[PDB]
RNA sequence: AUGGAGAGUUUGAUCCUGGCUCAGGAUGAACGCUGGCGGCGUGCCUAAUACAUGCAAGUCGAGCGAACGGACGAGAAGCUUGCUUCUCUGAUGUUAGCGGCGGACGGGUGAGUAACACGUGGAUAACCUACCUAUAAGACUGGGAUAACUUCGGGAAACCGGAGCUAAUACCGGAUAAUAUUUUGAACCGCAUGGUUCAAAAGUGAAAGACGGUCUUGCUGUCACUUAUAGAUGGAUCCGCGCUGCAUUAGCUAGUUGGUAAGGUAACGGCUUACCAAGGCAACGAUGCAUAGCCGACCUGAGAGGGUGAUCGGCCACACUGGAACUGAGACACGGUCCAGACUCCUACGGGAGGCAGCAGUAGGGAAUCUUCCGCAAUGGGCGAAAGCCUGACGGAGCAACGCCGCGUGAGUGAUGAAGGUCUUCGGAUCGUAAAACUCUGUUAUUAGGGAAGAACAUAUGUGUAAGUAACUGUGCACAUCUUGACGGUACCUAAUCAGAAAGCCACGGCUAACUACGUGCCAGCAGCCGCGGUAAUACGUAGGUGGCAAGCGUUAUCCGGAAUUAUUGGGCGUAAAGCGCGCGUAGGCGGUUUUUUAAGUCUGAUGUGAAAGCCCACGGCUCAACCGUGGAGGGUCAUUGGAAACU
């Protein structure tokens, strides 16, 4: 993170853009049925882009209004 | 005006005109409301080494006469 | 960034401290020997004291010395005399 | 605000009273694709919600104006369940609707919006002015004759109690605070107050 | 030097002034000595000067100076006219 | 007394203990999606990290020398008979200096400080206080000096280092008076001690400017002057209590604790320095380490209580870091000096300079927090007789849905199947009085006219009146003429036109009101909890519905509540977590009956105080509301004063 500590962070959604060295905005919140990861990633903040086709729960997962 | 008029009990008459009284009163506790005794050694200025150990002494405050004594003697209610 | 008033105040405080320490050392000298002249029962035990008590409130009606250190000095002379 | 159909809201709730009745056309249970079906019975938190909606969509408000006019009914000595009823009909939406200047509530709210009132003097163009007991409500002198105004006075009679009305430039008076009898008791106020207790 | 001033209260584009005897080195909306009365220019017609004139003369006799607007406030009521009769006697 | 609810989860099924997870509120919030406005607020919480540039403290010619500018008396006339050559009465204007005052306030910040820093209540017979106000007494007589200017040298510079002149409300000498001080008497107190007459000796000031009338004068009004008293103010020191986490910090001190002297401080004092004495503090938590400006207040809670210190007020501390003094009433000083240090800048390399935790702004840090704006018109501040100037205090404008409160985004009708898109036991139930299209409104949008409160002054010049004078100016007061407005052609008000352009956002198993159908088939994925997905998914992904509420919605972070899961109110220890393996005992806590008694605890009533703002209540002003103002619960914490005497 900004402070020099390591975490593991989940990615919600379907598709992501997260090869390596990308700047992402870590959101708090534990995801259970997964060991050792208790943080999310804000989908659509700095360098990750939104999901490819959501139109239903659209604000989280971060995509803009189609058409 | 007038100054504070505490009464106490001497603890250690050391040399050179100083005695230390022990004013004891009862502060109450904040949350539980139980009374509890606590002590306060007030240094005071004896004139000519009059009061001895064991006495109960009435005192009065005055201007700072030294670094730690602020009080003076007025009257001795009982002695030993 | 000196404001153009403070560059004039540093000038007039050097001009005004030279007049002070000339007068303020003269008051401390004239009581250094008059307190000596109170001792030894010398000749000018009523003349240097009249000079010393003079200068320690020439410098007290001006704000060299305070008007309670003036009365403290002139009581340390005139009691012992 | 709402801007939608009061017909559908009168289906799910009791009535919104656009005309004298609105639920007789379709099924009076629920609007869409699950209305004409077996009505599953409803819990306590639902029914404390539905009567609140039947009062909110009656006067055509929204929350934190419906809520901010709730706890200021908790200031007077009366019953809090009906102090909230009596100062809710003392707005310039109900008073324009009660002493009839409109065939319905929304254009009565639209009448006090655009500035056709001049209550007690100059103008109050807000639709949430709680009217104090004893000052007159008129129509603007610039617009005294419209097709909306006069041709809805003659249809709807029964100016309710603690009010007056006249034809001399349509001047109501708002005599005093109305009673629970002179207030629509189709929605019971005795269960809305437990919704805001939680 | 102590001087009778105007400490402004009220909101934006709606000034309300309370009149105050206070020291000249305190801030405007800050610490005060005594609050004499009020002043309101933006009312209906009047300025609505309220002054307890028995107390405003306790300060004018020992060094309080009105500053160019409360000197108009005190003259509007008549404290400054009545101030001469203490000096005349 | 308007004051208190819950649910899910251990099991095949119960009861209990017990944690966990939700439903409610808030924020200096951030982020994602979306986004007509209006009114009041709020907006670097991180790096007390470094700062480009403007710019925040100046003012006074009525303190006075100089200067500079230039009208106005302005010659002879170069004859171009008006160009001034210079000469001038120099009116009057401007400033670089000397000098007075202000720079110690306003403004910022919270690093340090667990402390008489702060809060509250006291004390000073141990205190200082410029301006302001009041009362008296005065203002006499002389002197020399130095910036400016002229000249020289160093330096491209900017500034140093010399030489000679000049003025003052600058400085200095001498007279004249004190209730100061030191010697001697007579009251009262709370220990030193005070207050109020006395009476003797020494001591100490100073300013003139701009007016008035009349005597070639000599008194004189305005406000500077200094002397002594008071008052008002601001400040200082001392004291009782109230002040975070650790004992896996138990010995701290050595000018430390007293004494007697001496100095010195506004002032008392181990405040400092000499000698003499061995004290001082500490389990009631000395010390040490760590953390933190404190409070009013704010948020939450039925209360008890918990949490926070943004904004707004009070106080303290700090001004690149660490010491120090000067000037002055006031500083050991935020846009002052000196020294030391770390950085940074200019350079002709000879030596010079700078400190945004002022206002905007930049870089950097960061999830995150704005314009290098306008104005002194209002209120306040400084300097002035005053006009007035200076005021990044303040009043406004700009940006941001950051919050709160208001309005919108249009309804009156009416095919209760027009189109088409879901579902379908396809005939139909839905979206749906939804919707085309008929009739009107214009909050608002825009253009086009009108338009303001804030704004009362000071100042001049007139009239009285009051004090004072020989008299008049002048001054104090009274009125009445005219004067100025950043916002702003803004608020707002009249007309003209148009249903135009102005909705999204998250949930749909059960808590929790709102579901069917396709896709997908332990995959892709959801998840606050329990848990959903393996071919008939109401929990995934989409589509039609519906609902919560709305210019917002949702997620995350943190805080309080729910949590009676720190329980004084209000919990426990046989087996669920919990009785030391038992003695002897220190400190502490607690303690049988009666009488007399005192008043510490206790109760009761007299004050005083706990500022203002806000919270609660009642009115007033905002077109309503937010908000703003005024009057009240009221200070209930505490201290001072009477009483009561059962209980400790």
Curated annotation (Swiss-Prot), chain B:
It holds the Pfam family Ribosomal_S17. One of its GO terms (cellular component) is cytosolic small ribosomal subunit. Coiled coil: none annotated. One of its GO terms (molecular function) is rRNA binding. GO terms for biological process: translation. Keywords: Ribonucleoprotein, Ribosomal protein, RNA-binding, rRNA-binding. One of the primary rRNA binding proteins, it binds specifically to the 5'-end of 16S ribosomal RNA. Belongs to the universal ribosomal protein uS17 family. PANTHER family: 40S RIBOSOMAL PROTEIN S11 FAMILY MEMBER, SMALL RIBOSOMAL SUBUNIT PROTEIN US17M. This is Small ribosomal subunit protein uS17. It comes from Staphylococcus aureus (strain bovine RF122 / ET3-1). The gene is rpsQ.
Curated annotation (Swiss-Prot), chain C:
One of its GO terms (molecular function) is structural constituent of ribosome. Pfam families: Ribosomal_S20p. One of its GO terms (cellular component) is cytosol. GO terms for biological process: translation. InterPro entries: Ribosomal_bS20 (IPR002583), Ribosomal_bS20_sf (IPR036510). The keyword Transcription does not apply. Keywords: Ribonucleoprotein, Ribosomal protein, RNA-binding, rRNA-binding. HAMAP family: Ribosomal_bS20 (MF_00500). Belongs to the bacterial ribosomal protein bS20 family. Binds directly to 16S ribosomal RNA. This is Small ribosomal subunit protein bS20. The gene is rpsT.
Swiss-Prot record, chain D:
It comes from the Bacteria. One of its GO terms (molecular function) is structural constituent of ribosome. One of its GO terms (biological process) is translation. Pfam families: Ribosomal_S4, S4. Keywords: Ribonucleoprotein, Ribosomal protein, RNA-binding, rRNA-binding. SUPFAM superfamilies: Alpha-L RNA-binding motif. One of its GO terms (cellular component) is small ribosomal subunit. One of the primary rRNA binding proteins, it binds directly to 16S rRNA where it nucleates assembly of the body of the 30S subunit. With S5 and S12 plays an important role in translational accuracy. Belongs to the universal ribosomal protein uS4 family. Part of the 30S ribosomal subunit. Contacts protein S5. The interaction surface between S4 and S5 is involved in control of translational fidelity. HAMAP family: Ribosomal_uS4_B. NCBIfam families: PRK05327.1 (NF003717), rpsD_bact (TIGR01017). This is Small ribosomal subunit protein uS4. It comes from Staphylococcus aureus (strain bovine RF122 / ET3-1).
Swiss-Prot record, chain E:
One of its GO terms (molecular function) is structural constituent of ribosome. SUPFAM superfamilies: Ribosomal protein S16. The keyword Ribosomal protein applies. Keywords: Ribonucleoprotein, Ribosomal protein. It comes from the Bacteria. One of its GO terms (biological process) is translation. InterPro entries: Ribosomal_bS16 (IPR000307), Ribosomal_bS16_dom_sf (IPR023803). GO terms for cellular component: cytoplasm; small ribosomal subunit. Belongs to the bacterial ribosomal protein bS16 family. This is Small ribosomal subunit protein bS16.
């Amino acid at each position: 993170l900004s402070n020099n500590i390591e975490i593991n962070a989940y990615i919600p959604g379907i598709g992501h853009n997260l090869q390596e060295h990308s700047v992402v905005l870590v959101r708090g919140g534990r995801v259970k049925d997964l060991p050792g990861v208790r943080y999310h990633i804000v989908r659509g903040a700095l360098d990750t882009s939104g999901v490819d086709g959501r139109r239903q729960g659209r604000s989280l997962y971060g995509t803009k209004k189609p058409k | 005006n007038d100054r504070k008029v505490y009464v106490g009990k001497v603890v250690s008459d050391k040399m050179d005109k100083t005695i230390t009284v022990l004013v004891e009163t009862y502060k109450t506790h904040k949350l539980y409301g139980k009374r509890v005794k606590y002590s306060k050694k007030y240094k005071t200025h004896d004139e000519n080494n009059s009061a001895k150990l064991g006495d109960i002494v009435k005192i009065q405050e005055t201007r700072p006469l030294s670094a730690t004594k602020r009080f003076r003697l007025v009257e001795i209610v009982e002695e030993s | 960034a000196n404001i153009k008033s403070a560059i004039k105040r540093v000038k007039t405080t050097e001009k005004a401290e030279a007049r002070n320490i000339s007068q303020k050392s003269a008051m401390r000298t004239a009581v250094k020997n008059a307190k000596t002249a109170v001792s030894n029962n010398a000749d000018n035990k009523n003349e240097l004291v009249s000079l010393a008590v003079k200068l320690v409130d020439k410098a007290a009606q001006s704000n060299l010395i305070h008007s309670n250190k003036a009365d403290r000095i002139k009581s340390q002379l005139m009691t012992a005399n | 605000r709402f801007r939608g159909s009061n017909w559908k809201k009168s289906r799910r709730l009791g009535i919104s009273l656009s005309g004298t009745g609105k639920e007789l056309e379709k099924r009076p249970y629920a609007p869409g694709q699950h209305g004409p079906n077996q009505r599953k019975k409803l819990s306590e938190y639902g029914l404390q919600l539905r009567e609140k909606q039947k009062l909110r969509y009656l006067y055509g408000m929204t929350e934190r104006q419906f809520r901010n006019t709730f706890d200021i009914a908790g200031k007077k000595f009366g019953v809090h369940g009906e102090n909230f009823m009596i100062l809710l009909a003392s707005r310039l939406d109900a008073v324009v609707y009660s002493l009839g200047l409109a065939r319905t509530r929304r254009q009565a709210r639209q009448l006090v919006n655009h500035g056709h009132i001049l209550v007690d003097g100059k103008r109050v163009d807000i639709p949430s002015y709680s009217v104090k007991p004893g000052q007159t409500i008129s129509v603007r002198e610039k617009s005294q004759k419209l097709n909306i105004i006069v041709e809805s006075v003659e249809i709807n009679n029964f100016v309710p109690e603690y009010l007056n009305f006249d034809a001399d430039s349509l001047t109501g008076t708002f005599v005093r605070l109305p009673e629970r009898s002179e207030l629509p008791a189709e929605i019971n106020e005795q269960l809305i107050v437990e919704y805001y207790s939680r | 030097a102590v001087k009778i001033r105007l400490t402004r209260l009220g909101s934006k584009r709606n000034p309300f002034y309370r009149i105050v005897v206070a020291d000249a080195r305190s801030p405007r909306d800050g610490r005060i000595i005594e609050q004499i009365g009020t002043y309101n220019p933006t009312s209906a017609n009047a300025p609505e000067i309220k002054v307890d004139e028995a107390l405003a003369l306790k300060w004018l006799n020992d060094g309080a100076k009105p500053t160019d607007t409360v000197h108009n406030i005190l003259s509007k009521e008549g404290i400054m006219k009545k101030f001469d009769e203490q000096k005349k006697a």
